Design an enzyme around this catalytic site. Structure first.
Site, short mmCIF file in Angstrom:
data_model
loop_
_atom_site.label_atom_id
_atom_site.label_comp_id
_atom_site.label_asym_id
_atom_site.label_seq_id
_atom_site.Cartn_x
_atom_site.Cartn_y
_atom_site.Cartn_z
N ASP A 67 -20.70 11.24 -27.20
CA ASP A 67 -20.88 9.80 -25.88
C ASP A 67 -21.94 10.81 -24.75
O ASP A 67 -21.74 11.14 -23.51
CB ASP A 67 -18.86 9.45 -25.80
CG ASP A 67 -19.54 8.89 -24.01
OD1 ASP A 67 -20.57 8.02 -24.13
OD2 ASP A 67 -18.73 8.37 -23.52
N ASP A 87 -21.63 5.94 -28.63
CA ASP A 87 -22.34 6.03 -28.87
C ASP A 87 -23.82 5.77 -30.76
O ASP A 87 -22.97 5.90 -31.69
CB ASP A 87 -23.31 7.36 -28.42
CG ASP A 87 -23.16 8.53 -27.81
OD1 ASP A 87 -22.92 7.25 -26.77
OD2 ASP A 87 -23.92 9.35 -27.49
N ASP A 143 0.71 -1.02 0.34
CA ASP A 143 -0.01 0.25 -0.33
C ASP A 143 0.66 1.76 0.39
O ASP A 143 2.08 1.36 1.05
CB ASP A 143 -1.32 -0.12 1.19
CG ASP A 143 -2.11 0.77 0.91
OD1 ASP A 143 -2.33 1.33 0.49
OD2 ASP A 143 -2.68 0.94 2.33
N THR A 156 -7.09 3.18 -2.27
CA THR A 156 -6.73 1.99 -1.88
C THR A 156 -7.65 1.09 -2.50
O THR A 156 -7.22 -0.06 -3.19
CB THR A 156 -6.45 2.56 -0.22
OG1 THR A 156 -5.12 2.85 -0.33
CG2 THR A 156 -5.92 0.41 0.28
N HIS A 183 -2.93 10.63 -1.28
CA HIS A 183 -3.17 10.28 -2.34
C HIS A 183 -4.53 9.93 -2.71
O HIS A 183 -5.38 10.76 -1.75
CB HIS A 183 -2.67 9.11 -2.23
CG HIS A 183 -3.16 7.95 -1.50
ND1 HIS A 183 -4.54 7.73 -1.86
CD2 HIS A 183 -3.05 7.37 0.00
CE1 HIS A 183 -4.64 6.52 -0.80
NE2 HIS A 183 -3.75 6.50 -0.14
N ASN A 204 -13.17 4.90 -1.60
CA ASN A 204 -12.57 4.80 -0.10
C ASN A 204 -14.45 4.79 0.49
O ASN A 204 -14.48 4.09 1.44
CB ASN A 204 -11.30 5.50 0.81
CG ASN A 204 -10.23 4.43 0.05
OD1 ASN A 204 -10.21 3.25 -0.79
ND2 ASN A 204 -9.07 5.09 0.86
N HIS A 236 1.36 8.94 5.33
CA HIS A 236 0.29 9.51 5.84
C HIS A 236 0.42 10.58 7.18
O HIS A 236 0.60 11.67 7.16
CB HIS A 236 -1.32 8.84 5.96
CG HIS A 236 -1.70 8.72 5.32
ND1 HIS A 236 -2.37 9.36 4.36
CD2 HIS A 236 -2.42 7.05 4.54
CE1 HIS A 236 -3.51 8.83 3.51
NE2 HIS A 236 -2.70 7.52 3.65
N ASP A 239 1.53 2.71 3.08
CA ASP A 239 0.69 3.92 2.95
C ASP A 239 1.23 4.57 4.69
O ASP A 239 0.58 5.73 4.52
CB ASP A 239 -0.54 3.24 2.42
CG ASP A 239 -1.22 3.94 2.43
OD1 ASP A 239 -1.69 4.97 1.94
OD2 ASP A 239 -2.19 3.86 3.66
N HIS A 276 -1.12 2.28 -5.21
CA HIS A 276 -0.92 3.51 -5.46
C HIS A 276 0.44 4.47 -4.60
O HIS A 276 0.82 3.96 -4.35
CB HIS A 276 -1.84 4.55 -5.28
CG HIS A 276 -2.31 4.46 -3.87
ND1 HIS A 276 -1.53 4.73 -2.71
CD2 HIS A 276 -3.15 4.03 -3.17
CE1 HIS A 276 -2.11 4.59 -1.51
NE2 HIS A 276 -2.78 3.40 -2.26
C1 LIG Z 1 -10.20 -3.73 -1.90
C2 LIG Z 1 -9.08 -5.49 -2.49
N1 LIG Z 1 -9.82 -5.08 -3.60
N2 LIG Z 1 -9.71 -6.66 -3.92
N3 LIG Z 1 -8.28 -6.59 -2.61
C3 LIG Z 1 -7.87 -8.57 -1.37
C4 LIG Z 1 -6.18 -8.63 -2.95
C5 LIG Z 1 -6.41 -7.57 -3.78
C6 LIG Z 1 -4.76 -7.82 -4.70
C7 LIG Z 1 -4.56 -8.07 -5.65
F1 LIG Z 1 -3.30 -6.84 -6.09
F2 LIG Z 1 -4.27 -8.53 -6.77
F3 LIG Z 1 -6.00 -7.30 -6.75
C8 LIG Z 1 -4.01 -8.25 -3.48
C9 LIG Z 1 -3.96 -8.26 -2.17
C10 LIG Z 1 -5.63 -8.43 -1.77
C11 LIG Z 1 -5.67 -8.67 -0.51
C12 LIG Z 1 -6.28 -6.96 -0.42
C13 LIG Z 1 -6.13 -7.07 1.71
O1 LIG Z 1 -5.56 -7.74 2.66
N4 LIG Z 1 -6.46 -5.97 2.28
C14 LIG Z 1 -7.06 -4.31 1.79
C15 LIG Z 1 -6.81 -3.56 2.66
C16 LIG Z 1 -7.12 -4.64 4.18
C17 LIG Z 1 -6.33 -6.24 4.17
C18 LIG Z 1 -7.34 -3.80 5.18
N5 LIG Z 1 -7.13 -1.54 4.21
C19 LIG Z 1 -7.07 -0.44 4.81
O2 LIG Z 1 -7.81 -0.51 6.10
C20 LIG Z 1 -6.99 0.52 4.36
N6 LIG Z 1 -7.97 1.49 4.25
C21 LIG Z 1 -7.22 2.11 3.25
C22 LIG Z 1 -5.91 2.53 3.44
S1 LIG Z 1 -5.36 4.22 2.31
N7 LIG Z 1 -4.09 4.42 2.42
O3 LIG Z 1 -5.99 4.26 1.05
O4 LIG Z 1 -6.58 5.38 3.53
C23 LIG Z 1 -5.55 1.79 3.64
C24 LIG Z 1 -5.38 0.45 4.34
F4 LIG Z 1 -4.58 -0.36 4.57
C25 LIG Z 1 -7.27 -1.79 2.92
N8 LIG Z 1 -8.95 -5.99 -2.04
CA LIG Z 2 -21.54 6.28 -25.19
CL LIG Z 3 -12.86 8.26 -2.29
#
Ligand SMILES: Cc1nnn(Cc2cc(C(F)(F)F)ccc2CCC(=O)N2CC3=C(C2)CN(C(=O)c2ncc(S(N)(=O)=O)cc2F)C3)n1
Ligand SMILES: [Ca+2]
Ligand SMILES: [Cl-]
Ligand SMILES: *[C@@H]1O[C@H](CO)[C@@H](O[C@@H]2O[C@H](CO)[C@@H](O[C@@H]3O[C@H](CO[C@H]4O[C@H](CO)[C@@H](O)[C@H](O[C@H]5O[C@H](CO)[C@@H](O)[C@H](O)[C@@H]5O[C@H]5O[C@H](CO)[C@@H](O)[C@H](O)[C@@H]5O)[C@@H]4O)[C@@H](O)[C@H](O[C@H]4O[C@H](CO)[C@@H](O)[C@H](O)[C@@H]4O[C@H]4O[C@H](CO)[C@@H](O)[C@H](O)[C@@H]4O)[C@@H]3O)[C@H](O)[C@H]2NC(C)=O)[C@H](O)[C@H]1NC(C)=O
Ligand code: NA
Ligand code: NA
Length: 804
Positions: free
Chosen positions: A682, A690, A120, A158, A419, A179, A264, A260, A308
């Site tokens: 579009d 379209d 992240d 994220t 971000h 989010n 922050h 991440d 990101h």
């Molecule tokens: C959403 C989502 N969609 N799919 N997945 C599973 C997944 C896919 C892949 C891949 F790469 F292969 F796609 C690869 C890995 C996975 C597993 C994802 C996973 O275990 N988690 C995603 C997540 C967890 C645990 C807890 N999170 C937060 O609380 C959190 N929130 C906001 C922010 S921030 N920085 O943006 O503010 C930062 C944060 F850490 C996000 N998670």
């Molecule tokens: Ca269209």
């Molecule tokens: Cl948002």
């Protein structure tokens, strides 16, 4: 949940059991559903994460987090450094990397497994700037296949990005558009915190793990509960890899909350950021050491990928809607590094989005956001076609925040990084590294978009991808083998080639021209220009294929060629070449309001000038610019009614500048350019062509449809020492999709000369050729000397106009 059941022998079970039976999977903590003994049995921590000299050859104590006993390898539960400390082996990072020409897997393995190590906020520049503290990651990068950066999707948050990685879909199509979200059909909200994000109605498309399962490929669970430490996540993956051939998964995911989480608090390059990068590297080292113990280090494909990047953002850099709007309590704002505005109450009939947009438009001189109706957002962002995306959007400048009122910033300075901004912004770029037998060896690949990985991870697992927004084959150049071999889509509509079939006097268009000016030398010569003698010059990559059912004509001329649509009464495309040597000339006085009938096209399938006179809002422009005619005789061709398109006077300022100045500038700098320009429609902002019946606006009193946008594709030789018309090697392209708008309210400096704002607007609306295809139903680059996968890569290229 009746938590009286046990997790004896069920720790991190891959199949989830149903309530009110207690759970032992890697998600149970997040639903507060684990069995009473889960912590004791599954989250053991005793004695740490690393073997030590004394612990070598020990008596198996089941309480230990990981084991150093002799039997541990066969149980598949050693500490990752066991063989280093207890058997004199080296760490994976200390070994010289050696090409992995084929999978070197244990017997029983039906395919190389895939492990996705997602991080992240891992900004792209960390690969260089933190390279001294990340030797494991740096070995993966340099020995594997790497890109200098990977482009996330907008918004660069994220959840939108992890699910885009999982599905190959734009957020508008998969549904996780932020989010934070409100769905007006459900009348439900979605947040990072809470329980509604666990409902499956939010999550469209088909993510990789469902694609795998449905096709008989077993998947580890991708999500990890926040409390489960990283070391335990790794050990669990290694434990699963030790399972029997009929139970062992083929695809696995790890996730880190870092860097991440620290970024922050401290900013992307805060001195406190070094340590989080050390720990992530250490975790990668643990994985690769664990793999090597299991003899899986030259079997498995490892993807190191981010969601990101991270930018410097502080509380002092916050625009407040309270300093623009009087009515600030009648709205709801999704705040932060982007802005989404809706009405606080749907019963308030006095709420008008138009007045809100106007009140947020160019009001302060340094204004650090810009408001948009969502359909006017740059088409490259593909952020519009979802009921969860509010009609009003704020694109916020990098480094800044938008909030509703100051109380929201000081009743919620804490953060120094964030971000979510425009996905072309350098600070938002993230990483990709692929390492393993199916990836190439010591190979750099160009930047690419994260929407493309779903297909590649399907290829890596022998799966057929679900329909998605990747262009399959555009990333074949990452792979040693398992390439997908695509075919060009079949052309659906073949063109007509009309000759001269109408007399001047059959046309009653209300159009005039001062062209009554009169030889066998140059009559046989112009004849052949209307049969296509300079077509080799002006149509360099073959004619585009029309991939839908319609009726159109190929029109040849000395300086350009077009596919003229009889349904839309204008070209779908217009192709021409401007060499480095070519000259800009003026539109002469006698031809200023000249429009001429095209004798190859019926009156009934032509536009007319009278409609443009009666339409006081609408004017017209030309696709092949008269400015660049090769000769005074050829210039007459540019004034044909079949080269004419509807243009607002405000948009004509832009188009004229592009055509008169920039096209020539590009031909100078690039050694000639081929330009293909045309209209786009579009109205329902789905990013797709379209049909006729979707057109919401016509030139008044007529069937001339109005484009929502105008595109151009500007191609030349990548080796710019060769001219565009004689290029032996790879191509270079840049493109744009300009919104066709009746004002220039988007450009705050549009009262000034076009040289101060037009190019800046075009850059903002830079586009991939693939974007233009979706929007037009055309297929470009049909006849080249280049491989199709190279053309696919070229079609997904985006010229970002950011520095290095
Ligand atoms: C959403 C989502 N969609 N799919 N997945 C599973 C997944 C896919 C892949 C891949 F790469 F292969 F796609 C690869 C890995 C996975 C597993 C994802 C996973 O275990 N988690 C995603 C997540 C967890 C645990 C807890 N999170 C937060 O609380 C959190 N929130 C906001 C922010 S921030 N920085 O943006 O503010 C930062 C944060 F850490 C996000 N998670
Ligand atoms: Ca269209
Ligand atoms: Cl948002
Ligand atoms: C990016 O890639 C994606 C994926 O390839 C592309 O999106 C596809 O575009 C297709 C064309 O627009 C679209 O095809 C339609 O499918 C409809 C059935 O859809 C359901 O089933 C699919 C398949 O499993 C599923 O994926 C869908 O999921 C969507 O909707 C749910 C919400 O219920 C969400 O969970 C999910 O996130 C996703 O939402 C997104 O898509 C919908 C549209 O499907 C958007 O509205 C959302 O905003 C969001 O973006 C669905 O569960 C099917 O019903 C359609 O058929 C109509 O149109 C045809 C035209 O040929 C017409 O002939 C038919 O008669 C029919 O019309 C009838 O209904 C009309 C409206 O109600 C009505 O006007 C008519 O009179 C008729 O009664 C159509 O075939 C496909 O679903 C999506 N897929 C996805 C995943 O989004 C996308 O184009 C790519 N982007 C770019 C830029 O290229
Ligand atoms: Na007019
Ligand atoms: Na303006």
């Amino acid at each position: 949940t009746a938590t009286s059941g046990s997790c004896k022998g069920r720790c991190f079970e891959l199949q989830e059991v149903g309530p009110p039976d207690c759970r032992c999977d890697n998600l149970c903590k997040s639903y507060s559903s684990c069995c009473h003994d889960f912590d004791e049995l599954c989250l053991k921590t005793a004695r740490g994460w690393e073997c030590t000299k004394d612990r070598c050859g020990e008596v198996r104590n089941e309480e230990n987090a990981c084991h150093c006993s002799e039997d541990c390898l066969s149980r598949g539960d050693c500490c990752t450094n066991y063989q280093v400390v207890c058997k004199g082996e080296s760490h994976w990072v200390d070994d010289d990397c050696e090409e992995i020409k084929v999978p070197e897997c244990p017997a029983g393995f039906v395919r190389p497994p895939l492990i996705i190590f997602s991080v992240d906020g891992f900004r792209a520049s960390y690969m260089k700037k933190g390279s001294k503290v990340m030797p494991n990651i740096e070995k993966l990068r340099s020995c594997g296949t790497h890109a200098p950066y990977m482009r996330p999707v907008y918004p660069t948050k994220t959840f939108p990005n992890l699910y885009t990685l999982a599905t190959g879909l734009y957020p508008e199509s998969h549904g996780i558009v932020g989010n934070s979200m409100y769905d007006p059909v459900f009348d439900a909200s979605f947040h990072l915190r809470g329980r509604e994000k666990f409902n499956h109605r939010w999550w469209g498309g088909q993510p990789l793990w469902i694609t795998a399962t449905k096709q008989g490929v077993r998947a580890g669970t991708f999500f990890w509960s926040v409390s489960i430490p990283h070391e335990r996540r790794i050990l669990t993956i290694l434990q699963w890899l030790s399972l029997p051939d009929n139970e062992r998964p083929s695809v696995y995911a790890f996730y880190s909350e870092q860097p991440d989480f620290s970024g922050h608090k401290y900013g992307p390059f805060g001195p406190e950021m070094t340590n989080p990068l050390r720990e992530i590297d250490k975790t990668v080292g643990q994985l690769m050491d664990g793999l090597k113990q299991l003899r899986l280090h030259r079997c498995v494909n490892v993807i190191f990928v981010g969601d990101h990047g991270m930018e410097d953002v502080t509380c002092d850099r916050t625009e407040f809607l309270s300093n623009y709007l009087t009515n600030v309590d009648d709205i709801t704002l999704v705040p932060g590094t982007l802005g989404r505005i809706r009405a606080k109450s749907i019963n308030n009939s006095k709420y008008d989005p138009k007045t809100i947009i106007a009140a947020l438009t160019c009001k302060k001189p340094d204004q650090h956001f810009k408001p948009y109706m969502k359909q006017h957002l740059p088409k490259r962002l593909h952020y519009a076609n979802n009921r969860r995306i509010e009609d009003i959007h704020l694109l916020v400048d990098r480094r800044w925040h938008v909030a509703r009122k100051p109380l929201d910033v000081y009743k919620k300075c804490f953060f120094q990084g964030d971000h979510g901004f425009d996905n072309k912004v350098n600070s938002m770029q993230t990483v990709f590294v692929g390492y393993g037998p199916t990836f190439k060896y010591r190979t750099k690949v160009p930047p690419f978009e994260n929407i493309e990985l779903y297909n590649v991870m399907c290829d890596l697992l022998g799966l057929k991808p679900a329909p998605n927004n990747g262009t399959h084959g555009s990333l074949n150049h990452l792979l040693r083998t398992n390439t997908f071999r695509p075919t060009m889509p079949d052309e659906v509509s073949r063109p007509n080639y009309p000759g001269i079939m109408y007399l001047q006097s059959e046309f009653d268009l209300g159009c005039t021209c001062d062209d009554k000016v009169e030889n066998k030398l140059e009559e046989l010569n112009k004849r052949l220009h209307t049969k296509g003698s300079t077509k080799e010059r002006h149509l360099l990559y073959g004619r585009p294929a029309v991939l839908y059912r319609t009726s159109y004509d190929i029109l040849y001329h000395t300086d350009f060629e077009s596919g003229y649509s009889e349904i839309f009464l204008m070209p779908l495309w217009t192709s021409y070449t401007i060499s480095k040597q070519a000259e800009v000339s003026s539109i002469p006085e006698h031809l200023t309001n000249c429009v001429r009938p095209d004798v190859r096209v019926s009156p009934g399938f032509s536009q007319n000038c009278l409609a443009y006179k009666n339409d006081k809002q609408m004017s017209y422009g030309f696709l092949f610019p008269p400015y660049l005619s090769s000769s005074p005789e050829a210039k007459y061709d540019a004034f044909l009614v079949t080269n004419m398109v509807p243009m607002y006077p405000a948009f004509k300022r832009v188009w004229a500048y592009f055509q008169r100045v920039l096209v020539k500038k590009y031909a100078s700098e690039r050694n000639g350019v081929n330009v293909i320009s045309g209209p786009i429609f579009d109205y329902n902002y789905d990013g797709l062509r379209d049909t006729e019946d979707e057109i919401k606006q016509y030139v008044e009193g007529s069937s001339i449809p109005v484009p929502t946008h105008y595109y151009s594709i500007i191609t030349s030789c990548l080796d710019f020492t060769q001219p565009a018309d004689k290029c032996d090697g790879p191509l270079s392209v840049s493109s744009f999709i300009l919104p066709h708008r009746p004002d220039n309210d988007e450009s705050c400096n549009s009262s000034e000369d076009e040289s101060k704002w037009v190019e800046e607007l075009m850059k903002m609306h830079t586009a991939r050729v693939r974007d233009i295809e979706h929007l037009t139903g055309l297929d470009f680059y049909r006849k080249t000397s280049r491989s199709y996968s190279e053309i696919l890569t070229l079609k997904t290229y985006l010229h970002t106009y950011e520095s290095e």
